[PDB]
Amino acid sequence: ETILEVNNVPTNATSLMERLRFPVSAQAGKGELCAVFRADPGRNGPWQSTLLGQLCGYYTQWSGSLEVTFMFTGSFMATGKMLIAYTPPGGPLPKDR
Amino acid sequence: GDRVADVIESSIGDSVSRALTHALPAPTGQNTQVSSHRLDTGKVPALQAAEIGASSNASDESMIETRCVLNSHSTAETTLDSFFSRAGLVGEIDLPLKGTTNPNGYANWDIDITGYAQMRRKVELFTYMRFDAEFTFVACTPTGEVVPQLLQYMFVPPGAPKPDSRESLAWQTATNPSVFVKLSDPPAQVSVPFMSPASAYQWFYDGYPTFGEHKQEKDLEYGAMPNNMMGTFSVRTVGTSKSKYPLVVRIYMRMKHVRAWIPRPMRNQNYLFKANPNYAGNSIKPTGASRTAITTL
Amino acid sequence: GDRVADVIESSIGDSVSRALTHALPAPTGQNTQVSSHRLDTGKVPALQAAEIGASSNASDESMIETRCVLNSHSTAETTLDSFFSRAGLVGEIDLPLKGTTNPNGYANWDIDITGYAQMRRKVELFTYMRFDAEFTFVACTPTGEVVPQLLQYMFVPPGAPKPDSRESLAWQTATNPSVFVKLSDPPAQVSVPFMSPASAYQWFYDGYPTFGEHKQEKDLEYGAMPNNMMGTFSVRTVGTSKSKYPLVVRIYMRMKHVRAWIPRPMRNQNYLFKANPNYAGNSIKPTGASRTAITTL
Amino acid sequence: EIGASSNASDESMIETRCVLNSHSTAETTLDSFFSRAGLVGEIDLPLKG
Amino acid sequence: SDRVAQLTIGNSTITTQEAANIIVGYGEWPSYCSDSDATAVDKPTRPDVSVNRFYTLDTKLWEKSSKGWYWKFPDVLTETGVFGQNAQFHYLYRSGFCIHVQCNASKFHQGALLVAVLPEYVIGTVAGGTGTEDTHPPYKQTQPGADGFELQHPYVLDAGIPISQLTVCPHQWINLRTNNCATIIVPYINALPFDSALNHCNFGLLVVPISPLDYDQGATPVIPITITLAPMCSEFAGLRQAVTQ
Amino acid sequence: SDRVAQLTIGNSTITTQEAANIIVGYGEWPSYCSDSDATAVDKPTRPDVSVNRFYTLDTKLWEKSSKGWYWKFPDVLTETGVFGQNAQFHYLYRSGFCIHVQCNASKFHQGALLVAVLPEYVIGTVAGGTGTEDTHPPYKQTQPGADGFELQHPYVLDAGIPISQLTVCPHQWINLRTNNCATIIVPYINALPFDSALNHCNFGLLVVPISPLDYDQGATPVIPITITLAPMCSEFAGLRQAVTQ
Amino acid sequence: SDRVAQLTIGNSTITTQEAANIIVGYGEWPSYCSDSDATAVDKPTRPDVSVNRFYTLDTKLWEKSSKGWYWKFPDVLTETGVFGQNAQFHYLYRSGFCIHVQCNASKFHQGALLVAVLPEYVIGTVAGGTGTEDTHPPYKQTQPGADGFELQHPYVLDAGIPISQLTVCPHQWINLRTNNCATIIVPYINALPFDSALNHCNFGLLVVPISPLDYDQGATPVIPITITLAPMCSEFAGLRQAVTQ
Amino acid sequence: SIWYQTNYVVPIGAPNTAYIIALAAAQKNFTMKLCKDASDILQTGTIQ
Ligand SMILES: CCCCCCCCCCCCC/C=C\[C@H](O)[C@H](N)CO
Ligand SMILES: CCCCCCCCCCCCC/C=C\[C@H](O)[C@H](N)CO
Ligand SMILES: [Cl-]
Ligand SMILES: [K+]
Ligand SMILES: [K+]
Ligand SMILES: [K+]
Ligand code: NA
Ligand code: NA
């Protein structure tokens, strides 16, 4: 496992490190979207930061399952429950939870 | 575990393809057996019912009196490899000095064998085909002259960077396969494996490659099968300065280790465009020749 | 047959109810065993976690020092038949001489035992009940006097014609069961089987009997279970002329061969209507008694 | 935090069928990856220069 | 080891690190209908993974003044996913359910919810207040769908029965200092082998605060309660066109 | 005994008293996908009776001037019944089909229809007539749904290939003096183990009059052709929300 | 039992009550050089306890704005204790290392450090900014000694390579809500059996905040990161006078 | 896609925002084929 840049938005050199982590915070309500990304490992985007993504670049075809492990780095006193979903081909970006 | 009877006596999940027919060896044409006259009621081999969907099962022996003929005529030349393992032209690339097309000493050809009719009509006899191939590259000037020029051929699979100049960094070819050959050498020749992500290439794909609305603007993608898109064949003269000679590269393909499935009717109208069956609606011609009347030759 | 592994290792169709618990014989109250002092770490029977959903498993022996008590106290009186096989009033029919109600010497009572609170509260302790029943009919005048009058009781199952007069042809009772008895005879009494189309009668049915839009006009059918609708009990004085006496028929039911499933909280508000749990919103009372403070009796 | 990669597999996260995988791992050996000739040097021998 | 748990069914997995065991209603796991209990003769359809999976249907906000809510089964799901479609195209249906109620707060918040399953949960009305009117609950109240419905009089469960005795039903508590979820497995409960998913709700799910939510000003004030459930051993029969009511 | 037949699958039964046997395309019955041909790892769903049953989808009128029609599979069914729902909720699909084409007339009517199944039936355009324009067929023509579509140039099958050779494909004829139906069983045909029911039509069904319909004035002039079909061994995988395109 | 740990080597013992296991780099424990891998013929000296022991070398302050630091091995220790003396008096040296990085905060603080070992950590320069100047890093930057050095551009690790892939190297994380230390055992890594402790750094230790340090005003704001390390299986050869460079 | 199932909850005194780090890799059934050059070439002019 290598770090996936889900937060691949900031581009100025002094904010590049921010690409390595994304946030969560107290929401005021219900079923809010936190983040989204394509699962395609050899496509431009978040996966380019991973060694998998890079090695993928030297091969035309691939096959297999992938896995993304999310580590929470808030304080010990913080709690929460998140729903992480994988939408197979054909399903458009989910509008709601 | 399963306790209800219907789950126990279920055929859900049966993965065995039950076949009604089987292949038999047949190295020669069938022989003819002696037959005699038959004047019998009830038995009637001449009468058929084409509606069933089968071909007639009547043979020479049951329709006329036959002698015995021992037939040694071979069936070997009609195997798929006999039919297809013959090299035919599938591509032509021009590298002129002055021009509109590939004028800068390099060219990128997307691999598609449907640009030439002889070859295209043969492969389209089937729906699916799986095979390996031998590619031969014949290069010379437009008059067929052989000049002292060095060329580089590079196979660029989908996703690899396509060169955009005779000096592109992509020609470093550290992973893609490249062939360096002189026009004065015999034609370059290599073996290519079966490369599709699918189990076979398919000359016909009745569908779309992506989901979504299929608005007229994106109807040029109907029938587009990415599984047949093997990449680009790129060629260049090897130099930082322009070549002194105008060049032509002819590409020949020879299939080998061929398997084919689902035969279909053969093309009877001229081809107009690559990978698409459009035909000229104003010039629909009969499949073959005509005559003036059904009662005269 | 099934060839794919997932079909073979499937539990689809398992009809065996896997039970985590089992009944044990228990004819007497549990005994008490001698216990002594325990001054130990790690072991802690007094501490619980009610969140789990289970009741405490701590016993007398583990909380105080106990002596041995051999308990012979029987558990027989708390079986369902002991509790329910006692006859209680479930219906009352008036046959007056002058009046608004049943003034013509006959009456039709739809069988429903929810009109009387003592009985209704006991059966509603459970959701489903299956049982046979013994019905006793006590008849007399409104003062409790016994007069020389002949009556006819007829059970009219759903779909059988309900009498509409003391002289209805339906009283021919050629198939329905009827009881002819005199008020001077002891109370009539009969045995009735479990008659529902369902496996049990259910005092609570969270649904509608029919499909369709459920517009406010037909909301009186919410919770209506035809499976509990056993028909009509019809009674008449046996004559073409009016009876000389005003009569009252009291109906008692005694369940027997009882089975019950799914216990529920017991009714804590007065009943208002038959077969429906409406309660007076302006008079919601605490389940039991109150006191002025939590620190004094 | 331990430093290891996740040990969770498809089978323990969703209900899976049986798949017999014949896909080869031969093309990702070091020789498959590296035994392909690439340009590493260029030398010019001009007339004037 | 009683506190950590993973529930996986279909293409869905739920995790919890503050559980309080699992309740199996009436000590019986769900099962398919036997050939001797069955009566309908057509071969049923048992879709399996496409219908027996977790569906997260709704989130409520727990407030210091919340009364409590209820949902009806299978009503909550009749319009969701492949399960909904089957419930609509078929006259007969039966299944068990795995219910997972979620609610996390912090070690400084407090409160306790009673999470219970009450079979045949018939709703009553206040009878015009005086108790003289035989009024009836409207459809949106007896079958509220995925939104659930708020209790008007939790003490008598809007049905004239004491919530103090609701624990005689399969249940768990979500007491914030202890756990953040409740998991209840319910077998199919009915007096018939199969029934209509539309006309009949086999049971109701009740989530009622018994010890009110509390915390000091400054601590996250939005404390959601999310309901996730999965049908188990679903069977459908009596196929025809799709019907919603 | 070759002429009488009964086809029963699911809750549906078809009868015919003037059949001409049954064709099993490419001499192979439909089957489920094996564990070695499969690639996708999720456990598929196989609904069985609720999707493998006969659906009567359309009726056409055979007229003395009819050109012929085609339907695409599984397109014809993606919006019908429980099958449609599954095809919409799942990315992957595969199944075989039993096709039963119906057409009865009288012993005084005449004509012959060719009923054939052509795998990967790619439609072409007339290229602007002159053949200089690279135009493409629109969606309603490549996937006509249950209505089917009428052939513009039957002789070249709207694809530049001779209908005279269409018999190299699984087929039967409905020759009125002989039979009143055609029955073809088709196994799943594709170069992949499963595929999208929406983006890809595995085969097209062609019903083309080759010997035109005729009868004397006074005989019933309305001669319908009805299409009834049943998916066989349907499997679905890759579940998510419902999608129609 | 994965969280509590005691490391004892030489006359030194380290304890931790919030550990996250131990990483053994490349799954191989340190060992002495075999007679077949060796080339130098003099009998080595293996001081044992006086050099293989824990040395606490430095403390850094983690601030909300910290970029990260690195240390080079064996550079950090060449001037410390009996180990330093041996590294100076001998031409040849080899050893493995047990690295223990320490950082405790409170249950109300948060943040995550990536602690990794990168063999042959060659430092690059920004090439005059425009990238046209072939400038080189100075000695104090390539071998910073016990003080370590602060990263100028952590994202590319001051060497044109992505820190996002640094986890392909032996590492642990110090995520404050979970643990307060990282322990990595590194075997001797080199393409030669012994080498100069002065001219060559076999690997660099990187301590980089990836999830920034945070806490509310009023909580202890000084959060140190202390580095303690122990050489393992140290061997020295090629004795002469002491040399520092 | 990542959604809030309930909510991020914290007591008085703990930060209101926290971060998640994602780590990705392939499973054991993962294989690749048809070796090709990567889309990027990390040099502009000649490397000196
Ligand atoms: C160094 C020179 C190597 C040249 C590499 C040639 C690779 C050719 C692979 C054979 C591909 C078969 C043709 C496949 C598809 C058809 O052309 C069309 N796309 C069908 O629409
Ligand atoms: C000749 C006299 C025969 C009298 C026949 C009496 C038959 C009574 C059958 C017992 C029925 C049990 C009560 C069933 C349902 C409840 O009363 C309500 N409908 C519940 O809503
Ligand atoms: Cl990809
Ligand atoms: K022969
Ligand atoms: K006893
Ligand atoms: K394998
Ligand atoms: Na014959
Ligand atoms: Na205990």
Q: How far from A77 is each of B217, E214, G228, CA to CA, in Å? A: 55, 17, 29
Q: Are F117 and F170 in contact (CB under 8 A)?
A: yes
Q: Which residues line ligand 2 (CB under 6 A)?
A: C 111-114, 133, 135, 153, 155, 177, 179, 190, 192, 195, 201, 203, 228-230, 233, 275
Query: Does E106 touch chain H if contact means CB atoms closer than 8 Å?
Result: yes
Chains D, E in contact, 3 or more Cβ pairs below 8 Å: yes
- Residue nearest (by alpha carbon) to ligand 1 atom 18: B112
The Cα–Cα gap between B195 and B156 comes to 13
Q: Which of F229, B225, B181, D4 is nearest to G167 (CA)?
A: D4
State the CB neighbour count (10 A cutoff) for residue B3: 16
What residue has token string 């992957």?
Answer: F92
B131 lines ligand 1 (CB under 6 A): no
Ligand 1 atom with minimal separation from the B179 CA: 1
Is B153 close to ligand 1, i.e. is its CB under 6 Å away?
A: yes
H-run or E-run covering G85: helix G81-89
Decide if E139 contacts C214 (C-beta within 8 A).
yes
C236: how many CB neighbours lie within 10 A of its CB?
A: 26
Place of tokens 């015009």: E128
Q: How far apart are CA F123 and CA E41, in angstroms?
A: 45
Q: Which residues of A touch D8 (CB under 8 A)?
A: 67
Residue C214 to residues C96, C126, G87, Cα–Cα distance (Å): 40, 28, 91
Distance CA D18, CA C10 (A): 12
- Give the long-range contacts of residues A12-19, CB within 8 A, separation 24 or more: A13/G153, A13/G155, A16/G155, A17/G154, A17/G155, A17/G163, A17/G210, A19/A49, A19/G155, A19/G164
DSSP D33: H
Q: Is the CB of B113 under 6 A from ligand 1?
A: yes
Exposed, middle or buried, C39 (CB in 10 Å: 0-12/13-18/19+)? Answer: exposed
Residues followed by a break in chain E (C to N exceeding 2.5 Å) are none
Fold category of F1-245 in CATH: Jelly Rolls (2.60.120)
- Chain-chain contact of B175 with D38 (C-beta, under 8 angstroms): yes
Identify the nearest ligand to the CA of C112 by its number.
2
| E16 within 8 A of A80, measured Cβ to Cβ | no
* Residue owning the nearest CA to atom 4 of ligand 1: B155
- Are the beta carbons of F134 and F125 closer than 8 angstroms? no
Cβ-contact A20, G210 below 8 angstroms: yes
Among C230, C232, C256, which is best to mutate for testing ligand 2, by the most ligand atoms less than 8 A from CB?
C230
Helix (H, G, I), strand (E, B) or coil at B231: coil
Q: Is E24 on the interface with C (CB under 8 A)?
A: yes
**Binding partners of C (≥3 Cβ pairs within 8 A):** B, D, E, F
Answer whether F161 sits within 8 Å of B268, measured CB to CB.
Answer: yes
Q: Which residue from G minimizes the CA distance to A5?
A: G164
Spatial separation of the C-alpha atoms in residues G142 and G121, rounded to whole Å: 9
CB-based contact, E204 to chain C, within 8 Å: yes
Q: Which residues of B265-284 are buried (b: 16+ CB within 10 A; e: fewer)?
A: bebbbebbbebbbbbbbeee
Q: Around Cβ B48, how many Cβ atoms within 10 Å?
A: 13
G77 lies within 8 A of chain D by CB: no
Interface test with D, best of H23, H27, H35 (most D CBs within 10 A): H35
Q: What experiment produced this structure?
A: X-ray
- Chains B, E: CB contacts within 8 A come to 11
User: In terms of DSSP bridges, do strands E5-9 and C178-182 run parallel, antiparallel, or are they unpaired?
Assistant: unpaired
| Cβ contact D3–G179 (<8 Å) | no
B23: distance to nearest CA of chain A, Å?
35
* Burial of residue D25, with CB atoms counted within 10 A of its CB: 0-12 exposed, 13-18 middle, 19 or more buried: exposed
Nearest to B13 by CA among F190, F9, F31: F31
SS3 of C260, please?
Answer: strand
The finding on whether B177 has its CB within 6 A of some atom of ligand 1 is yes
Resolution given for this structure, in angstroms:
2.3
G168 C-alpha to center of ligand 3: Å?
21
Which residue, among F43, F48, F235, would best test binding to C if mutated, counting the most C CBs under 10 Å from its CB? F43
Angle at F85 between CA F80 and CA F86, to 5 degrees: 120
Q: How far apart are CA F25 and CA F117, in angstroms?
A: 9
Q: Provide φ and ψ at F48, rounded to 5°.
A: 65, -125
Q: What is the residue-wise DSSP string for E162-182? A: -GGGGGGSSEEEEETTT-SEE
Question: Which CATH fold topology does B1-297 show?
Answer: Jelly Rolls (2.60.120)
**For residues E197 and E242, is the Cβ–Cβ distance under 8 A?**
no
Query: How distant, in Å, are the alpha carbons of C123, C277, E27 from that of C120?
Result: 5, 11, 28
Using the Cα atoms of residue B179, residue B185, residue B187 and residue B192 in order, give the sign of their dihedral.
negative
Count of beta carbons in the 10 Å neighbourhood of residue A24: 22
In the three-class reduction of DSSP (H, G, I as helix; E, B as strand; rest coil), residue C83 is classed as helix
Are A60 and B158 in contact (CB < 8 Å)?
A: yes
Distance CA C35, CA C69 (A): 11
Do residues E46 and C29 touch, judged by C-beta distance below 8 A?
A: no
Measured CA to CA, the distance from residue G99 to residue C47 in angstroms comes to 44
CB contact at 8 A, F239 and F89: yes
Exposed / middle / buried, residue B4 (Cβ in 10 Å: 0-12, 13-18, 19+): buried
Task: Tell me if C24 sits within 8 A of C54, measured CB to CB.
Answer: no
Mutation choice for F interface testing from A87, A95, A96, A97 by most F CBs within 10 A: A87
Assess contact for E182 and E172: CB atoms under 8 A.
yes
Residues of A with CB under 8 A from a CB of E: 26-31, 77-81, 83, 97
The answer to whether residues F100 and F54 touch, using CB atoms and an 8 Å cutoff, is: yes
Structure tokens at E66: 């919340």
CA distance B50 to B48: 6
Distance CA A78, CA A90 (A): 36
Answer whether F235's CB lies under 8 Å from F44's CB: yes
Probe site for chain G from H8, H12, H19, H47 (most G CB atoms < 10 A): H19
- Ligand 2: which of C84, C89, C111 to mutate, most ligand atoms within 8 Å of CB? C111
Mark yes or no for CB contact D6/A69 under 8 Å: yes
Query: Which ligand is closest to the CA of C158, given by its number?
Result: 2
Ligand nearest to the CA of B159: 3
Q: Judging by DSSP bridges, how do beta strands E223-239 and F181-186 pair with one another? A: unpaired
User: What is the helix, strand, coil percentage profile of chain F, to 5?
Assistant: 15, 40, 45
Q: If DSSP codes are grouped into helix, strand and coil, which group holds residue C228?
A: helix
Report whether B80 contacts B258 (CB < 8 A). Answer: yes
Cα torsion A42, A47, A51, A52 to 10°: value is: -50
Please name which ligand lies nearest the alpha carbon of C45. Answer: 8
H/E element holding E114? strand E110-119
C-alpha distance from residue C164 to each of C167, C170, C175 (Å) = 8, 9, 18
Contact H23 D32 (CB under 8 A): no
